[PDB]
Structure formats: C-alpha cells, structure tokens
C-alpha cells in the first residue's frame, strides 16, 4: 500500500481512517476525534534510547462500524506490521473500552462523532456548526456527540453545545469539580484545533444558560441523575493454540505465576485475563505464517468461545519484543540478551535518565525519584523500640541495628532544595509479635498527627527495606538480625552459624541481611559473611563490588571477628561444610539502572460498597491527574507510594495503607506483601515522588485547579 | 495531657480549674498548681510543674499545694521539673507563660471568693515583667511614677503618672486590655488618661486628687553540696568554685547547687537515690533555705538525672549527656524557643530567610565587597588584596564588609585583634572602628572579634579559600622568621567555609573533629580525623599551597611515628563531638537589659521586637556571639560603653563564658539579618508609629 511507506519513519503518532478498504490520513490537528460509524488504523513510533524504532499498532472500531469496514481495519493491521516485519505490538480497540496505552496518546481527551463515511461525513477543517457532547469520566475524557435536546442532558455530566463560534459549556449541578476541570479541555480542544482559535467559549450551570443556549434547545425542564469492576483480577491462565491454519485450543498453566519457557518458539499461545479485560496473544518466532497471519482472527473465536464481552481488549505480541505487563505474568523473566530492554512503555520514553551522584542530589528531584533518595540521610533521625505500648528510645551507640524480634519507628529529618520534610520509617521485624507490629503501626499514625499529619509514612517490613533507609547511618551498613530483641529485659543468644547477605544500593549504603545459612541463599551480585565457631568468612561474588566489601567489613568490627576473604568458586571445604552441603545460587545479575524500563511506573486511583476498585490513569504522570477529592496510588516497582488528597473522604484517607495492601494482594504479578508503602499527603509530597512528574509546580493547589482553568486559557 | 498550659487554684485540699481566660489572675491568699506541658520535636511531652504561693496564704493550702506538686510529678513517673514560685519573685520560666503580666487579686479561699458590679483598683509595676497588684480604692495607693487601672465593670479607666515612663504605660495598656477582653468578653471601653484629665466618674469614686509622690555583679560564684536524710537534713560541700565537674553529681545521692546570693537554688535528684529522699526534695531545699538564711522567697528548682535545665547545666565545665550526638534536641527544650522551626544551613535559599541567618550566624553568603585595613601605629593601612583572608597574630585589622540580604544592604565592620598585637595598636584599631562607624552614618554593625574566637560569617569571606591565621609576626612592611614546627588547626563552619588557626605543636592541641596540618623541618603532614569532612580537608590542601609543602595524608589513629615526635610525644586530647546543630537547645538565645553599678535583668518568654525598648541597650545573648541592641533614644553614655557592658556581662556570667567571645553592636532600624531572624514576628515599620501612639489607638480605644 502506498501509505505503508509513509509509515512509521520518525517517532510520533500517525492516524489513518479506513474508508472504503483504503487508509486515508485524518488531519493532525483533529487526532483524537473518531466517527462512530467508522474504522480507524493507528500507529505509534517509540524511539528506542538505542535508536532503534519501535511500534504500537491499534485499529478502533466504532460502534456503528460496519462489519466491512473492521474487517478492512485489521486486514490493514496485519499487512502494515507485516511491513514492518512483525516487530509490532498490535491492539484491538473497541469505542468506549480501548486500552490505557492508546488512551494515553490523547491529552485532550476522545471525541466520538455521529456518522461516518457511509454516511458521507468527513474530517475537514466556513464552521456552521450545532452538535452537543455529553462529556463523562473522570481521568480518561470521552465526548460522546448526542441528539441537541435537553432530553440528553443530565444534573451529573457537563455538556457542550458547540454553536461554531461561540463553545458552551455547560456544568450539572451535581457535577462534581474535577470532571468540570477536565470538560474544559475538550472545548479548548474544540476552540484550538478545530476553530483554529478564533471562537470563544462560555461556561454556565443549571439556571445560568445563555439565551444563545436557551433559543437552541428550547426552555428548560428537568433533568434526572447521572449514572456511573473489582480486584478479583489476579488469577490468570494461559493455552496453546491449534488450527490457525479452526481453532482448539489446549490448556498449559492454570495459575498464574508462569514458567516463561512454557513459550515455545514454534507455537502461539493466548494468555487468558478475559475477566479483567484482556487477553494476550504471544506469537512464536518459528511459528508458521498462515498461525501468525491469523492472530487476532484466533483471538475473537477464543473470546466467542468462553463467552466474553466483544470488548474485550486484544493485543498480540511477538516473540522478543513483549511488553511489561505481558511479561509480568511470568516467574522471572529474563530477556536473553545494550541500552534500554525488549519494550520502552510510551509514557516513560521522554525521561531522561538521571545517574546517582551525590553532591548534586539536593539539586535533582528526577535523581530523588529515580533512586528513591530524598536526601544523603545525614539529617537528624529519632530511633525507637516498641515494648508493649510504648515507644523506647534505642541505644544510640547502636544506631542501624535492627532485630527481627523487634518494631522500630524512625523519625528523619529531610532536607532537599532549600526545602524541609519529614519521613517516619516504621521497620516490622518478621518475628515481632502482634501485638507489638500493630502498637507499632498505632504509634507511627498518632506520631504522624501529633507533628500537623505532614510527615511521610513508610511501612517497611523485614527483608524488603528501602534505598533511602539504608543510607542513614553514616557510612555504616544498616544491619538487620534474624530474631531476637534488643530491650534490656530478655537478651538471647545468637546462633551457632550465621550467614549475612550485603547489598548495596545505587548511593553505596549497604545493608546486612540475615539470612539462613544455607548455600542457595547466597546471590552473585553481593558480599556474604558467614561466621561459624571455628571460623569468620568474608566471601565476595563476582558480581560484588568495593562497597559491598567495605560494607560487609565493617558488620565484622560489630561482630567481633576477623575475616578471612573469600572469592566466588574459588572457596575453602570448611566454608561449604558450614551450609550442610553445596546447592546453586542466584547467579543471573540484577536489573540496576534498567528497572525503570522493565518496571515503570503507574498511577492509579482507587476506591472503596464494601468492594475494591482501581482505574489506571493513562498518559505521561501529570500533577493535574492528581485530584484533590481521590487517594492515588503511584507504584514504583520498590514501592508503593499512596497520595492522600486533601478534600478525600476521612474513611478512605485512614485506609490508605489497606488500600495499598490490597491493591499489592491482588497484583497479578504476585508482588512480594513485604514491599514498602508509603503515605504522603497533598501539598508535602517528598522528592522521590515529585521527581516522576516533569512539570510539578509548588503553588499548584495555591489557586483552586478549575478557578484557575475557567480563566487561564479563558477570559 | 496534650500540650498548653494547665492552672489549679488549690480549694480545700482538692485541685480547681482555673478558667482558661483567667489565667494571670492568682488570689493572694490562695496557693496554685501550674503545669507547663511542652512537645519535644520528637513528639514527646515535657513537664513544668510549679506550685505558686500567695502572700497572704496559710501555712495549709502552701503544703496543699506542696503535696499536690509531688504526687502529680508522681503520675507523670518523676520526669517533671519542678519550681516553688512565691508572689512577686516567680522565676523567669513561669513569668514567660502569661504574656500580659500577672495580676495580684484581693482574698482567697478563706475569705470567700472565686474566679466567675466592680470597682477595684490595680497598681501597675514593672517594664519586662509588668505585675499589677490590686490596691485600696483611694488617691492614698497612686504615685507618680506608676500606672493604675481604676476598674469600674463596663468603663475601665487606665491612669498614668507623669514621671511614669512611656513604656511602662505600653505595658500597662496590655493589662487594661486583657481584662476588657478575657474578664469583659471584649464589651467594656477603656479610657486612657493622665494627671489633670480624670473624668468625673474616677473623681466620682476616688474624691480630689491630692499632691501625689512620685545591686547585681553578685551573680557568678556558687557552691555545690551533697543532701543526706532528707529525717533532719545534713550536707556537704562538693566543690566551692564555680565551674563544677560534671562527675560530682552520682546517681545515688542528691545535691543542691547553691546560687542563693543571686535568688536561686537547684535540688537534683539521682536515679538510684532512695525514693524518700527524692520525694522531699522541696523540703530538703527549704531547710536549706532556712539553714543559710536565705530569704524565703528564693526561687526553687528541683531537676531529674538525665532531665536538667540547660542554666543548670552550665554551671558545669563541659556538659555531655552520655548519649545524644543522634537524636533529635537533648534534656531538655527551653519552652521560650520551643515553637522556633529549625533551618539547616543552605546558601542559595540563604538570602530568603532571615530566621536562617539568625540559627548559623550568616547575614549572607559572604562574597559582597570588602575592604581590609591593618593597623601601624596610630592610622589604617590598605591591606595587599592578593593576601587577603590572611591575618598575623601581631597585628590588629579593620575589615569593613557590604553585604545583602532579602531586597537590602547594609554594612559590618569586623574589629580583629591578634592576640600578639600590642596594647596600643590593638586599643588604637578600637577607637578607628568606632571611628569609621561614625563616619559611615552611625549605621554599620560593628563587631569585635579576638584571635582564635573567629565568627562563623567572618571565615566566610574569601571565596573557598580559608582563613589562615598565623600566631605572631606582621603583615607590616619588617616580616620575621616562621618557627620550624608549626601546627595548624582547621575548622569548618556550617557554611562550608573553613579557617586555618596556628596553634602551639602539641597533642593537647589536637581535635577528632578536624583537620590539621603539621610542617616540621623534614616532612608535611595532613592528619585528617574521624569527625573531619571534605570540607575540612579540602581547607587544609591550600594551607599547603600557602606553606609551599606538600603533603603525607594522615588518618586518626593511624599515624606514622615521626608524626608523633614532631610534637614532643602523645598526650591526651579532646574526643568530644561539638553540638553544631543542638547548639541552639544546649544554649537558647537569652534577652537582657542592661544598665551601667551592673544590673542586668532576664527578659522572660518568646522573643519579642516589642520587648526592644527605644531608650534601652539591650543584649541578645546568642552562644556563640553577644549582641548589644542599641535603642535610638537610649542615653549617649549608655550608647558608649556597650561595649563594656556587653565585656561585663560576659566576666560576670557563671558558666565561666570564653573572655574573647564575639561581641556585635547593632542599631535600633539598622539590625543585621542575623539579629532580626530570632525575633519571629519581626516588622520592619515598626519603629515608625511610636509603639505606645499605636497601641493606645487601634489596639486599644
């Protein structure tokens, strides 16, 4: 086709409408506007930080589509990723239920017109114009087009009568603020691209129409109420398929932690999540064309087959070039092989990488959120033990010792541009009893209150501690014991033989793990310490680096013995003796500074009927998305950040830790529970979050968002 | 308890809320209980537990009174201070809680009345702490140097001597005031007046106006004694001398610091000290009170081991709690900077926050122009600019800085006084700097600094290049010989900024906390201790681009043996880490007036421009430096020994203060960032409505 061509040669979006079994290219300033009773083809062009170019291709089908014109839309999606020698990643979009990756590619929201090329209707920027959209939604923004009659309208939506020169918008009474600020978007949209700016938009509510408004629609009656899933979405099943050259499909996992290697090169298989809305097809490198030509024809019968909704969402993926939440399904992928990974998530492509350094950290909120450090971690910090109910302070000559008999609260004291905050690490020890983790938690919340309830709140537990705790000891490693405790009532014994892992992070703190001494705990990348009677090792892995060393040196000062050095397959008999034997370790490194491209991150929002709701917010991260009235959650892959809007209600602002739990408990990825969360309210956000957000501004919330919007492009 | 301020009036044996609007009100024939509770940055509570005495109180209700305090400093588990207040001598901390002044009512329990048709008189004394005590409803009560306050219910009528002073009736309008507003719930009028205009209704009640009418450098030597039987009570002297060693207070015993010639006396309590003789620890100090005697209004603080007042403390030589260098704050938390929110040092936002400039004594980044004069005999002397950031310990400077902060410029004029200087050039650098001031306008800071005491913004000056500060010799030009072994210490500030100050080459001489350089004939060391940051280090790399030599890093603990025998040995040196950042809890920022005999008096409670009084020299005694606050109408010979009076406050302190303390002059409407950003709250127009003019406008009626 001679547009395949012109297809995907720069990075950007290209939308084409299919029109009578052609592509025809929709004007650029009028993206995002779709005609329900057509077919479109879209195509996304990632820059690969490598330089190599990368593909999302979607076709949308709308809902007065004909069956012709979407047979012609997907034709062409498999002929064009044909050109581009299946390196695509394809997407089926059905009008109202796309997905998150093509909801992100319009800021100004979706636009769904009445009619199409049957029809006889056309994208064509001499405007005499009188539609009206309804406008619903709340993070994505769809305008539905709809008969121009007050029987359309409703006192929960916000509606447009689009008159050509003059734009009205108009709000229900029982809108709700934050949908009226994104209404205004699309009549800017309307006003900017479509007027080329020359039209001037009005806004009114109930009572307050113009007479322009009032000559159109006739005098105004009464108008009844608006009208707007679940977190079972965990459990996922994958099969083999058969026939694409009459499809049987043969059932080869059923839960849902996946082994990776059940993905063998000469098959295609489907990845079943039809009850949270997609499915996956994964094509196989050596799979025989006439299979890999059918994809999503095999897909449709299988979502005929176990009867779920037509809109259900479709992608297929090839071999290599698989996409995060595809490859989040499985245990422990690995690609087998530069720069950046198999797939770069669109909405990340334009962060700039930022290296740890030090001395410019107090500069660099992009370097905070990157690294997930507020500051170096030398500022004033408090150090308490719980016993019983009551908060003991701990002995300051032991600062960075923690026992996992134990509950500690830290209070710190941050500093980061010329700016201070405060975070309150509460550290649960594995074997810490009940009743104390819980007085624990208790402590850290009324802690929280009792300094204006602006300090930051961090649940970490045993194991799983993060970047910025580590790094507040000095150059001393934070240490961490197995079990026991450290009040002056009951001091144990240690154990016979000990084992201590020793990671560092991207700032060179390390911390040092207790782990049992067996030899499959042992990890490549990192420095160990045994110590056993007789002897006091000190083993280093290939992997390991200098900081590792000076780190675990440094835990044998505090444990009073001396080393004897140790490098990785080249180890003493009395050293393996004391593990019981050998085994095998984890040798396979880790991702460092790639983990932003397996693992980036994701802003939802969430909700508690008695039910747990959460709706991902599509896009580049914008404070904007952050509305006043909503608890967000920001998943980094470390951790867990919950925003607490100002104006929530006070049942979901004393759940936000639940919340995040539970949105942990039901990730389909199965998501270690002990990973940290971490509380932050509106207006004292910490670097490590602000970070993510290109364009955060401090006076932000200072004018009211929608006071601000009904004027600053207005008059 | 949360935080606030909690009063009881002590009613037959029981404890009665005092109404909240009601506090400063206390019955003379009553006694009190008063619990301070403070929150600690932590988080934690601290406690202040006073019991207040009336002068007209029973032997009774005063051991009421006496019982209650002890067992509530038992629910709250023996942490609390605790203090006997007496009417008309209450301690500094209780007199900071009631912002309005006290006032000293008629009655009590025994004669039938409460606090729930008036016609009461009040005598108003007092200019830091007002007191206004009730009087006869008569001419007989009036004088003329005092304000009274005739209270008639809905009219009261504040009446003001003619010799009374014009800030005595500010102070007083804030007592008229408050009883319009918390006993009159703001619906009463007040009526200001003077000799010759009483309105008819004070004639009315008060007949025809008659004819009317109208000790300190003590404070520096106390004693230290150990309490047995606590039974019938004996002692012990400890140590007679002031500065104490921390090591004569043992846990098991109680001690009681005697500071009776200047009105106070301390009870501590060990932890393993039997639980009787802590209980009466009042009782203990009062015997003590009677056995010296001491007069009986002598304040009385009683202190738990670990919990101790940081004026305690500093009768002591050196005081380190075993634990906090980590931790947030330490013993204790003075209640007047306890909502002070705490800046570190951060040289870009540096120009925005005054209260930054105040907390790290930086009125700016230090780069503004400068010029440096040295002193040969009797004249100034353009320093060599190449050398600047240089000093020699013969010579005395004049170093006359421009500096900016927030929109303004100002200017500050740094005295230094080498310490090998001669008496006549280093007095003659003295009267050219007062010289050059008033040359200037009048305007300038004028700050005195001796050699070896450097201030933090002064070491601040010379780009990253450090202050290098050699014992003897002249920049004059006949320049001597450098001795063959020199030591040098270097210290850094919280700005970063460092200062290279020679010592004499010994072991004593050295400090864990920062980095020296040592050139003996052979070699150049640059020992580096554990304590010592980049910034330490990086200023000991261009002493040795100075000295010419070149170096053989040295760590702590660690040192070559040659090292060692170019200082004749190794002896014991100071470990201690400094307090930097706690400076601020150990030493609070105190107020003074001072009048030159030598009287100073304390300023209670936050710190308040209002309390800068126009005909005042005051002094705000920050640790590391004494400002005196020069009040535009204060009198020229007031004015001319500020001076002194700041170098006699310092000579009279008892926590036996540094003799070469820095010492700045500032000018009432020309006070440097560093001064104004202590006082929260500060107005730059304040001055410029007469203080009383306003407050009996608007404020008042």
Redesign the interface.
């Known amino acids: 086709h001679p547009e395949f061509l012109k297809a995907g040669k720069e990075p950007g979006l290209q939308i084409w409408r299919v029109e009578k079994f052609d592509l025809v290219p929709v004007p650029t300033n009028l993206y995002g506007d779709f005609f329900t009773g057509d077919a479109y083809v879209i195509l996304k062009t990632v820059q690969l930080r490598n330089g190599n170019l990368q593909y999302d291709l979607h076709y949308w089908l709308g809902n007065e589509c004909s069956q012709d014109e979407s047979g012609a839309a997907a034709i062409f999606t498999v002929q064009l990723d044909d050109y581009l020698n299946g390196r695509a990643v394809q997407h089926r979009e059905v009008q109202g239920f796309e997905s998150a990756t093509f909801l992100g590619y319009f800021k100004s929201g979706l636009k769904y017109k009445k009619g199409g090329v049957a029809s006889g209707f056309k994208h064509v920027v001499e405007v005499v114009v009188q539609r009206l959209f309804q406008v619903k939604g709340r993070r994505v923004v769809r305008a539905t087009e709809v008969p121009v009659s007050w029987e359309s309208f409703n006192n929960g939506n916000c509606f447009i009568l689009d008159l050509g020169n003059n734009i009205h918008q108009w709000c229900g009474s029982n809108s709700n603020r934050y949908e009226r600020l994104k209404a205004t978007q699309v009549s800017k949209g309307i006003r900017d691209n479509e007027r080329s700016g020359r039209a001037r938009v009005h806004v009114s509510e109930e009572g307050t129409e113009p007479e322009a408004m009032l000559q159109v629609l006739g005098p105004k009656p009464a108008l009844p109420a608006g009208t707007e899933d679940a977190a079972n979405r965990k459990l996922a099943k994958l099969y083999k398929v058969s026939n694409g050259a009459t499809m049987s499909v043969s059932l080869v996992a059923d839960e849902n932690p996946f082994a990776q290697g059940a993905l063998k090169s000469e098959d295609c298989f489907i990845l079943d999540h039809g009850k949270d809305g997609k499915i996956f097809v994964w094509k196989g490198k050596q799979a025989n064309t006439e299979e890999r030509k059918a994809a999503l024809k095999t897909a449709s019968d299988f979502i005929t087959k176990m009867d779920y909704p037509k809109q259900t969402q479709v992608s297929v993926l090839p071999e290599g070039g698989e996409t995060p939440l595809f490859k989040q399904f499985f245990k422990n992928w690995r690609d087998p092989d530069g720069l950046g990974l198999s797939y770069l998530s669109s909405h990340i492509a334009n962060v700039e990488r930022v290296p740890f350094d030090a001395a410019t950290l107090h500069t660099s909120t992009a370097m905070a959120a990157q690294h997930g450090m507020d500051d170096d971690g030398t500022?004033?910090?408090?150090?308490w033990r719980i016993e019983g109910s009551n908060k003991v302070?701990v002995?300051?000559?032991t600062?960075g010792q923690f026992y996992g008999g134990d509950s500690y609260i830290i209070?710190y004291?941050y500093?980061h541009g010329?700016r201070?905050g405060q975070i309150i690490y509460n550290w649960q020890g594995a074997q810490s009893t009940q009743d104390e983790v819980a007085a624990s938690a208790i402590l850290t919340a009324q802690?929280d209150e009792?300094?204006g309830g602006t300090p930051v709140q961090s649940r970490v537990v045993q194991g799983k501690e993060p970047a910025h705790l580590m790094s507040l000891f000095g150059g001393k490693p934070m240490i961490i014991y197995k079990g026991g405790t450290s009040r002056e009532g009951g001091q144990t014994a240690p154990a016979s033989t000990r084992l201590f892992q020793v990671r560092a992070n991207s700032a060179g703190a390390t911390r040092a793990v207790e782990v049992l001494p067996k030899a499959g705990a042992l990890n490549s990348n990192d420095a160990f310490v045994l110590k056993t009677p007789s002897a006091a090792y000190l083993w280093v892995g290939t992997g390991a680096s200098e900081a590792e060393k000076t780190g675990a040196q440094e835990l044998l000062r505090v444990l009073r013995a001396q080393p004897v050095q140790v490098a990785e397959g080249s180890e003493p008999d009395g050293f393996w003796e004391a593990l019981g034997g050998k085994a095998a370790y984890r040798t396979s490194p880790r991702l460092k500074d790639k983990k932003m491209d397996a693992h980036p991150p994701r802003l939802f929002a969430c909700s508690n009927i008695g039910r747990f709701v959460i709706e991902e917010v599509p896009g580049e991260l914008m404070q904007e998305d952050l509305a006043t009235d909503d608890v967000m959650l920001l998943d980094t892959w470390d951790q867990v950040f919950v925003w607490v809007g100002k104006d929530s209600q006070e049942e979901e602002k004393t759940e936000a830790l639940t919340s995040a739990k539970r949105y942990i408990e039901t990730d389909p990825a199965n998501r270690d529970r002990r990973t940290p969360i971490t509380v932050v309210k509106q207006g004292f956000e910490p670097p490590s979050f602000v970070g993510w957000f290109l364009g955060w501004d401090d006076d932000y919330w200072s004018v009211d968002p929608l006071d601000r919007a009904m004027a600053e492009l207005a008059a």
Do not use: H, S
């Open positions: 500022g004033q910090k408090q150090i302070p002995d300051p000559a600062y209070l004291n500093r010329g201070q802690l009792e300094l």
